[PDB]
Design a protein around this ligand. Structure first.
Ligand SMILES: [Mg+2]
Ligand SMILES: [Zn+2]
Lengths: 77, 96, 145, 290, 151, 89, 1114, 43
């Protein structure tokens, strides 16, 4: 029920670095916030919150929850 | 609405001299009465902050990247050890 | 024979000509970076560079007027030296001799004096800046946190 | 006021020291000794007196009273502050850095006299001015260190190097025993070995691992005297420095991430206790440049 | 060893503890230059400050051409002199000397690569450390297939 | 004297004032100083208007036009870095 | 006798000499400057008493300094004979209210005499409105109260120094002659074993050339000066010879580029040093020169002669040669030694009279230049004294002194103690003084000569430590400007009742006893061993009849503010400094109570400050009210004192004055009629006395924080009235006249509900942040309506005037009650600045209670913000159900080394519940009985003098014999601690907790003023970053070290957005605000504006600074 | 932003940066309060 509610050691062991983790969660939060501001445009590239969400929640908390749950991946170009 | 908004939105507390790395730390804000910032005792010596009189500044991380770095890199519960020598710094000693 | 050679190399290897050693034209700051702003009560607040530029144009125009008609070489040379001193005080006020003061209290701020020192652009406006979304208040201890 | 206790021996001890000081002074009035020698022996015997009354105070105190309970617990306070609160203040520096031959025989509990308070203000104002200029100079040194030490970033995971720094691990050994180094925490700890170490044909510690209490204890118990550890001075990397040659970070306790500004952290850590040093030469001794 | 031990015994006389690597970073930044002599074959001026990397690259260049290398003695200089003698003139200008370095850069016509942190703070770009590295900003984030199949 | 006072009118002030307005303002200043040293007090603008034969609105307009700009770089006090130009939006 | 309220004193030794008038430093100096009735009465009383005193005033001296001048022909002369003053045309309240300067006209009788015509024109000329000092010691200029502090400077004279050079491996001596006004000269001996002179440090030169340039020939030098080998070597090595060659050489070296001339060099040497106008050495300068050099009876005032230079040369060479004693050249047998510039007998204070005299002298010199220029271009028989002199430079110099100067300071009126301290401050900075960059360790430190002349305890602890310092309690000032201190004469071992005021010069030649030294039944010393002091600050003793002076009081070394601290000798010097510098920040509360324990000087420190209404004449009270006190004096006159009720001080605190006298009680001269701010019964009261327990309490008193009861909120204990003034003016701009009107456009009716008919908020109308105070509208603005707004305007309709809303609103986070509005109209008789048509000022007053973050403090350097205002039932309570009022951490005191507060607390408890000591037959009991502190009623104030306080045995024994409260049982154990319950759990605390009464102050670091916040507000103009400050909605500064910390984290994005998004981007800020409001993601940051400004400034220094992309340029 | 250059600025570069000649020392008009023509502050 706070910032620390995602345990951070799990995020590090699922990422293996700390700057990768923060930019990873930031990109996912940007995608979720762009999805919320779609206004029904139905854009395909923006995928909504994969975990359950309350009536109001910051996109970054959702992003960290999906990173912690292990149901999302990223690769370097 | 303000109580609803400030949740899960970290802010950077900062004491002015900021000699070392731990002079800027991210905290989760919480609404309190009065006109003074309530700070944790357990972190005060990280800021070198006594309560004789000591104004602290609060900056607002703004985008997703900034508050993500606040939550991950800057969180006060992740800064137990002092970077100067690796000894713990978040165990002040006056009354505890 | 070492040190001089280095500077000669600095003019030989690169493409910059030494025609920048002595200058024929003087650039001016854009006017919003040397503002003359209205102040309440009918007053004005003017940057010192406006005064320095005004002195440069005054001396240059007087030299032009002296060259228009027949003038002795001493008067012409004196006005040329005044123009040179005005340009120098425009670039550095106080590098040579007594700095230009103005009202009689403090030296007139020049072009290079805001690229230098604690009050310069590098240290007071680039590395350290004011910020928005910021606040400041006294701290009290909360053990319940 | 009953929690701060003056020693009962202090009265008779300062009485005896004033008796012998009166004997010395009445000996000096005949001119048998120069004033400089008298001043030197007087400051010597009064330093002896203040050390002895500090010992008397440290013998008088019980383990139950709050002031000792908060100085012996590491909570807040120092032993010299209790020395100059319970026992007598001691020798106090005069202006321009010499010492008054006459000490301050009164504790802060008994209350100083007028002239003792004046000569204490002599040192207090000097301390305030010194700490102001010291924190200014510490800030200047920190700025210079930051600007010289920047653009030093961990940019590689590891080198191919096996060269390192030969650091002493156990020293000052007595007859028949080995003792580890006194300052191993800030010299050998949080580093990595450049190569394996063997004493009896078997490896004690592997290569490229952080060093902690148990590993150093095993090394000093098995009988090693020096350790070739991987340092940043011997790092040969094409860009910046690597994480392995730097060693593990001290802020997080794990290996430093690729991209952490180690030069800025180093400069800030060097310049932070500049205002904490609080050092000045006590007395020049009448000679300059020594 | 001398510099590390001297600064550590200055700090340890009070009681403050600082790890040796913090000193060693600055010491490595201190011994980075060289003073060159008998540089008649390396085709540059003698008796001036040369970076170790540039000196070594010039040594390989002159031994690949067949000529004999120049001599070089390591030079220990102050932190101020090591700060001013930098490649990027923005960091030199933002430090103590502010007029002389700009004139020297204008005469030398030197263009600075915008690496480093002072001249990336000045211009407003991301610093090349921590989250601002190229290797951290090149990742692409997309959901997994089973997460899409679940919802 | 003519050339020196003409160049003083056209060059001394940063906001340039025409020569007729310069002689008007300095005549007003000198007669105000004369009335101050005669009456021993600051003269009222109405008496100055009658003695100058001008309207009082013209007199106050002249006093308004007779100012001198203040530099943006004047320090406030003990602090050198906080400038007068950084207090105005 | 009834001047002061009752206060039981714990002093052991009687005071021979009472503390002098604490405001004399200002009033006596300005009375000397004016030369009014008080100064002439003082000088005639001192003359008939035989004391040395100047019979010449401050303005008559400066008028007689301007001698009748002569033109090139020596024709004219003008003489300013007599100066006089008229009563001011405006009263002091008139000047304070209506934005004036309290001043009186200054006339002088000037006569114009022409020798050729024999014609004398005597006339009276008005020299300007000279500002006046009130009876309070303040200058009311431009409606504001200022104080002109004294200035510590170096006394003019000769100064000899010795130094050691590592390269030379020998000692080098130097001499310098620094005057009051003229140029300086130096003499450095044996730089390379040659002696040389510095004439303003221009060119290399020697001593022989200067002596030969003067009236003495080479033979006289080799005859009289031939017993020192180095000067003989310089004489024999001097190739030049003769007066003419030496003078031409010195003129060529001093002024190169022109051929030497006899008359030019003679005039330059006569004008540089010998000119009576360019080298006006002061009276103090001449006195010090002839005292150090031993010149027996020289001219009282004048320039240095060749005799003084020769004597200085002899003194320097004698000092270098080794001997420390010699016969004075034209003088007697005197001692030769080097002197340090930090000795307080060489440090002189320019008081207010001397500073204003110097400013008037500068103005008169400008006037003399102007009148010379006038008479060079004017014909004779057309010159009138009303015409040729101009008083504009004098008034301009005076007005330029009283404003925009480092000496004439805005007086702080936080409390009477701060006012007195501001009056008594000696400031080493300022024009013609030692600046902060010029300061070193040696001048800041406490000198042994500061005893009794300058307080070693209190000084500003910021960057100017030691530079500014408060004068001692008993300090007096010489006419020259040296600070004296009184000592009792000691004859044949008997301390007599004769007092001599000694400065730091005569104090060294004597031996000074201590006031703490015991005395027997007679005035002889009871103990042979006495602790004394002598020359150089040595503290060694001397037995028997050898002392010859004694201190008048142990209060002698401490200032007025330091002496308010009880148990100072127990506190540390640093904590004493902090407490003394921090008692000046104590705000005045609603009703004040004098300290229950505190030094007895508080009555004198409150009465000598002038805010307390005292009787000018003795009589009986006739009528009493909150606004005035009307008394009928015994001679028959009726005098009414008006009281300032809820008026604003310079810091925002109220200066409300309570009344203590009854309807018909008798009144003597100087008796306090009405209180002031932060006073009770004429006694200083800067705070409240509260029940204190030392204990850690759940971490809310951590790092010396403050826990306190709600009884200090509900009972109105720690609360204060704060009055803030805020003004606006309706001007006549170019477009039109600004109007103060009610008809504010684009606003609802309920917002302007509380406005008056002309647009003024009513008196007593409660107002909050953002509310309309006074309705001002700008006449018009360049109108460019958008088609959308044009269509909207068509639907709703808008005002024909199209005026703009620029009314004066309440600042953010401010709540108060409007207590006054002042309106100045141009159409009425009120005077207004040019341009403006009318002006309005509104005062809002708020009764601020005590809250979180409000800084409180004691008198012993202890301080802390408030972390929790507990409920009354939550505070730990005593054995009778009495809750403690404030909880203090006991962790602070042993580390801070100020146990004296604890001492105070014990005596505070002893003053709460009184004691009964009678017939106890103990040492402390007999001391208290002979003193008089043996039968004390509960609640009565006690007094411990700052170095004669109550001893340890007295506190312990009185704690044994405290009177019981109820059930016949006393509540604090003899250990000083009491068994204390818990207010939360209810179980009693395990060990006894020390309790008592500490007098706690409320500082002016109020949390309502410190708090400030900003999301988006005003932006700066030269660069587009936000501006700074609390009142202008500015942003916090993210300095260089903050940016270092964020790089050390390695957070590039947060740093980039704190440098480029949250400031310095003209387009990024608006786009980010749009993105936050619309909920979309934050746009990418652009380029900061300050970098573009840097590029533009580098481009105009002729540098082709061009940005390059990968492909090309930009 | 590959790099940032600096060098001596000749008269040609100064004329190229400039949008015109500042031929008068006048800055603003004293009555209309509008910037003067062909001088400093010129629009
Ligand atoms: Mg503090
Ligand atoms: Zn490496």
């Amino acid at each position: 029920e706070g910032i620390i509610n995602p345990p951070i050691d799990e995020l590090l062991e699922a990422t293996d670095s700390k700057y990768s983790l923060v930019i990873y969660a930031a990109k996912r939060a940007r995608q979720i916030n762009a999805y919320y501001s779609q206004l029904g445009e139905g854009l395909l590239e923006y995928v909504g919150p994969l975990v359950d969400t309350h009536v109001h929640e910051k996109p970054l908390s959702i992003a960290l929850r999906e990173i912690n749950a292990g149901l999302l991946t990223s690769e370097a170009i | 609405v303000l109580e609803e908004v400030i949740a899960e939105h970290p802010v950077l507390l900062n004491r002015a001299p900021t000699l070392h790395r731990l002079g800027i730390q991210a905290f989760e804000p919480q609404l309190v009465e009065g006109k003074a910032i309530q700070i944790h005792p357990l972190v005060c010596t990280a800021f070198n902050a006594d309560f004789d009189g000591d104004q602290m500044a609060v900056h607002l991380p703004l985008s997703a990247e900034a508050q993500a770095e606040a939550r991950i890199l800057m969180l006060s519960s992740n800064n137990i050890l002092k970077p100067a020598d690796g000894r713990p710094v978040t165990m002040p000693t006056q009354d505890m | 024979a070492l040190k001089r050679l280095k500077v000669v190399s600095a003019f030989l290897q690169t493409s910059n000509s030494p025609k920048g050693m002595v200058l024929d034209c003087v650039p001016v700051i854009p006017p919003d970076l040397r503002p003359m702003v209205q102040l309440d009560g009918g007053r004005f607040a003017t940057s010192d560079l406006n005064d320095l530029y005004r002195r440069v144009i005054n001396r240059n125009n007087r030299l032009k007027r002296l060259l228009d008609l027949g003038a002795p070489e001493i008067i012409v040379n004196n006005e040329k030296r005044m123009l040179q001193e005005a340009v120098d005080a425009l670039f550095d006020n106080g590098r040579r001799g007594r700095p230009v003061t103005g009202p009689g209290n403090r030296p007139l701020k020049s072009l290079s004096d805001m690229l230098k020192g604690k009050q310069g652009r590098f240290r007071q406006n680039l590395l350290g800046k004011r910020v928005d979304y910021s606040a400041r208040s006294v701290i009290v201890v909360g053990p319940q946190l | 006021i009953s929690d701060i206790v003056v020693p009962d021996a202090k009265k008779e001890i300062v009485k005896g020291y004033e008796g012998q000081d009166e004997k010395v002074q009445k000996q000096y009035e005949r001119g048998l000794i120069t004033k400089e020698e008298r001043t030197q022996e007087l400051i010597a015997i009064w330093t002896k007196a203040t050390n002895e009354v500090a010992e008397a105070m440290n013998d008088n105190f019980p383990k139950t009273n709050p002031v000792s309970m908060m100085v012996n617990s590491g909570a807040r306070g120092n032993m010299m502050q209790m020395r100059q609160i319970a026992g007598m203040r001691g020798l106090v520096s005069n202006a321009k850095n010499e010492t008054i031959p006459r000490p301050i025989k009164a504790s802060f509990r008994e209350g100083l006299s007028v002239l003792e308070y004046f000569i204490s203000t002599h040192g207090a104002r000097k301390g305030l001015a010194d700490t102001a200029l010291r924190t200014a100079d510490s800030g200047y040194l920190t700025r210079r260190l930051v600007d010289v030490s920047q653009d030093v970033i961990i940019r590689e995971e590891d080198c191919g190097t096996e060269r390192g720094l030969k650091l002493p691990i156990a020293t000052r050994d007595a007859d028949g025993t080995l003792r580890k180094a006194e300052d191993v925490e800030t010299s050998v700890y949080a580093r990595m070995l450049a190569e394996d170490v063997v004493i009896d044909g078997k490896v004690i510690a592997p290569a490229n691992v952080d060093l902690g209490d148990v590993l150093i204890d095993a090394l000093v118990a098995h009988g090693v005297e020096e350790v070739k550890t991987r340092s940043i001075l011997t790092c040969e990397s094409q860009v910046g420095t690597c994480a392995m040659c730097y060693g593990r970070s001290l802020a997080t306790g794990k290996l430093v991430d690729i991209g952490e500004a180690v030069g800025i952290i180093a400069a800030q850590s060097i310049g932070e206790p500049g205002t904490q040093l609080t050092m000045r030469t006590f007395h020049t001794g009448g000679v300059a440049g020594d | 060893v001398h510099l590390v031990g001297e600064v550590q015994k200055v700090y340890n006389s009070q009681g403050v503890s600082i790890h040796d690597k913090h000193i060693e970073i600055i010491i490595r930044q201190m011994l980075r230059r060289v003073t060159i002599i008998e540089s008649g074959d390396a085709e540059l001026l003698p008796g001036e400050l040369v970076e170790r990397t540039k000196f070594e690259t010039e040594n390989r260049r002159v031994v690949q051409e067949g000529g004999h290398p120049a001599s070089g003695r390591p030079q220990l200089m102050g932190i101020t002199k090591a700060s001013l003698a930098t490649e990027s003139w923005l960091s030199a200008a933002s430090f103590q000397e502010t007029t002389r370095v700009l004139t020297d850069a204008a005469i030398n016509a030197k263009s600075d690569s915008l690496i480093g942190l002072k001249e990336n703070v000045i211009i407003g770009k991301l610093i090349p450390a921590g989250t601002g590295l190229s290797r951290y900003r090149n990742i692409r984030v997309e959901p997994t297939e089973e997460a899409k199949a679940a919802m | 004297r003519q050339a020196i006072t003409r160049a003083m009118a056209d060059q001394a002030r940063t906001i340039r004032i025409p020569v007729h307005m310069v002689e008007v303002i300095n005549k007003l200043a000198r007669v105000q100083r004369q009335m101050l040293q005669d009456l021993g007090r600051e003269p009222t603008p109405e008496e100055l208007a009658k003695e100058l034969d001008m309207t009082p609105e013209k007199v106050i307009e002249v006093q308004k036009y007779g100012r001198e700009p203040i530099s943006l770089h004047t320090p406030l006090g003990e602090d050198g870095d906080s400038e007068f130009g950084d207090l105005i939006e | 006798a009834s001047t002061a309220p009752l206060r039981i004193s714990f002093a052991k030794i009687k005071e021979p000499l009472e503390v002098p008038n604490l405001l004399a430093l200002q009033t006596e100096s300005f009375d000397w400057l004016l030369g009014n009735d008080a100064w002439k009465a003082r000088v005639e009383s001192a003359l008939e008493s035989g004391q040395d005193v100047p019979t010449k005033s401050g303005l008559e001296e400066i008028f007689e300094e301007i001698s009748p001048i002569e033109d090139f022909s020596g024709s004219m002369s003008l003489t300013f004979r007599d100066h006089r003053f008229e009563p001011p045309k405006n009263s002091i309240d008139e000047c304070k209210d209506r934005d004036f300067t309290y001043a009186a006209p200054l006339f002088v009788t000037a006569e114009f005499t022409n020798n050729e015509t024999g014609e004398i024109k005597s006339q009276t000329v008005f020299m300007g409105d000279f500002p006046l000092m009130t009876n309070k010691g303040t200058f009311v200029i431009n409606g504001t109260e200022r104080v002109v502090v004294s200035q510590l400077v170096r006394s003019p004279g000769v100064y000899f120094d010795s130094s050691i050079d590592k390269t030379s491996d020998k000692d080098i001596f130097s001499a310098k002659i620094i005057p009051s006004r003229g140029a300086w000269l130096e003499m450095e001996i044996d730089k390379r074993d040659m002696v040389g002179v510095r004439i303003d440090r221009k060119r290399k030169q020697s001593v022989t050339v200067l002596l030969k340039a003067l009236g003495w020939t080479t033979e006289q030098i080799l005859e009289e000066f031939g017993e020192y080998e180095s000067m003989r070597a310089t004489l024999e090595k001097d190739h030049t010879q003769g007066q003419d060659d030496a003078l031409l050489d010195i003129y060529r070296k001093l002024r190169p580029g022109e051929p030497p001339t006899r008359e030019a060099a003679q005039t330059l040497l006569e004008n540089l040093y010998f000119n009576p106008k360019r080298y006006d050495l002061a009276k103090v300068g001449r006195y010090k020169v002839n005292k150090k050099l031993g010149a027996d009876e020289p001219l009282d005032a004048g320039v240095l002669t060749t005799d003084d230079v020769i004597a200085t040369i002899k003194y320097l060479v004698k000092l270098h040669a080794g001997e420390t004693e010699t016969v004075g050249e034209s003088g007697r047998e005197i001692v030769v030694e080097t002197d340090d510039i930090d000795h307080f007998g060489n440090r002189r204070i320019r008081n207010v009279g001397e500073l204003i005299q110097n400013q008037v002298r500068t103005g008169l010199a400008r006037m003399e230049r102007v009148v010379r220029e006038r008479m060079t271009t004017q014909d004779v028989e057309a010159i009138t004294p009303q015409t040729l002199i101009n008083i504009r430079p004098v008034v301009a110099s005076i007005k330029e002194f009283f404003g925009t100067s480092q000496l004439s300071q805005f007086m702080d009126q936080n409390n009477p103690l701060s006012g007195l301290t501001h009056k008594r401050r000696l400031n080493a900075l300022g024009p013609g003084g030692l600046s902060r960059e010029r300061a070193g360790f040696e001048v800041r430190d406490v000198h042994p000569s500061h005893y009794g002349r300058m307080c070693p305890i209190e000084t500003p602890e910021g960057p100017n430590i030691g530079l500014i310092g408060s004068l001692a309690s008993y300090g007096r000032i010489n006419p020259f400007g040296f600070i004296e201190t009184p000592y009792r004469k000691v004859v044949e071992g008997q301390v007599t009742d004769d007092v001599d005021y000694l400065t730091a010069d005569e104090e060294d030649r004597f031996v000074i006893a201590q006031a703490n030294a015991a005395l027997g039944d007679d005035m002889r010393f009871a103990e042979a061993r006495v602790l004394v002091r002598r020359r150089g600050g040595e503290v060694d003793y001397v037995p028997g009849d050898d002392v010859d002076y004694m201190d008048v009081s142990p209060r002698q070394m401490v200032s007025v503010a330091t002496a308010m601290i009880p148990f100072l000798e127990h506190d540390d010097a640093n904590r004493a400094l902090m407490g003394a510098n921090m008692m000046r920040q104590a705000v005045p509360l609603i009703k004040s109570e004098s300290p229950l324990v505190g030094t007895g000087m508080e009555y004198r420190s409150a009465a000598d400050a002038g805010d307390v209404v005292k009787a000018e004449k003795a009589g009986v009270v006739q009528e009493v009210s909150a606004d005035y006190i009307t008394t009928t004096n015994d001679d028959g006159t009726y005098i009414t004192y008006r009281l300032a009720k809820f008026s604003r001080s310079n810091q925002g605190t109220s200066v409300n004055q309570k009344v203590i006298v009854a309807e018909g009680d008798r009144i003597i001269e100087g008796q306090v009629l009405a209180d002031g701010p932060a006073t009770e019964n004429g006694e200083m009261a800067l705070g409240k006395n509260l029940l204190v327990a030392f204990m850690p309490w759940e971490g809310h008193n951590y790092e010396d924080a403050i826990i306190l009861s709600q009884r200090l909120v509900q009972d109105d204990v720690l609360s204060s009235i704060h009055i803030e003034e805020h003004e606006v003016d309706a001007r006549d701009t170019k477009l039109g006249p600004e109007e103060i009107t009610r008809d504010i456009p684009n606003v609802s009716e309920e917002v302007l509900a509380d406005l008056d008919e002309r647009g003024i908020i009513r008196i007593g109308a409660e107002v909050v942040a953002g509310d309309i105070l006074v309705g001002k509208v700008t006449p018009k603005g360049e109108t460019e309506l958008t088609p959308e707004e044009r269509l909207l305007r068509a639907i709703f309709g808008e005002k024909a005037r199209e005026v703009r809303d620029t009314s004066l609103k309440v600042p953010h986070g401010e709540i108060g009650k409007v207590i006054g509005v002042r309106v100045f109209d141009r159409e009425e008789g009120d005077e207004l600045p040019p341009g403006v048509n009318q002006l309005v000022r509104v005062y809002v007053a708020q009764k601020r209670k005590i809250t979180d973050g409000d800084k409180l403090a004691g008198r012993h350097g202890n301080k802390g913000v408030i972390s929790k205002i507990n409920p009354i039932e939550d505070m730990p309570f005593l054995e009778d159900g009495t809750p403690v009022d404030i909880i203090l951490n006991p962790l602070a005191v042993p580390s801070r080394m100020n146990p004296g507060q604890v001492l105070e607390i014990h005596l505070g408890w002893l003053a709460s519940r009184g004691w009964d000591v009678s017939g106890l037959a103990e040492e402390w009991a007999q001391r208290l009985q002979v003193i008089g502190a043996d039968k004390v009623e509960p609640g009565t104030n006690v007094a411990t003098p700052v170095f004669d306080g109550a001893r340890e045995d007295e506190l312990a024994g009185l704690l044994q014999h405290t009177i019981p409260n109820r059930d016949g049982e006393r509540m604090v154990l003899p250990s000083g601690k009491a068994r204390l319950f818990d207010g939360r759990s209810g179980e009693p605390f395990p060990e006894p907790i020390s309790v008592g009464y500490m007098y706690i102050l409320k500082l002016h670091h109020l949390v309502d003023d410190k708090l400030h916040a900003r999301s988006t507000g005003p932006y700066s103009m030269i660069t587009q970053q936000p501006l700074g400050g609390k009142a202008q909605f500015g942003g916090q500064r993210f300095g260089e070290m903050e940016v270092w910390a964020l790089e050390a984290y390695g957070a590039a994005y947060a740093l980039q957005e704190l440098l480029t998004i949250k400031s310095d981007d003209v387009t990024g800020r608006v786009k980010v605000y749009e993105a936050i409001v619309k909920g979309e993601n934050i746009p990418e940051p652009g380029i900061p504006e300050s970098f573009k400004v840097l590029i533009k400034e580098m481009q105009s220094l002729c540098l082709n600074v061009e940005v390059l992309s990968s492909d090309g340029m930009s | 932003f590959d790099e940032l250059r600096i060098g001596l600025a000749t008269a040609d570069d100064i004329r190229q940066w400039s949008h015109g000649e500042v031929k008068k020392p006048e800055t603003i008009n004293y009555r209309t309060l509008k910037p003067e023509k062909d001088g400093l502050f010129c629009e």
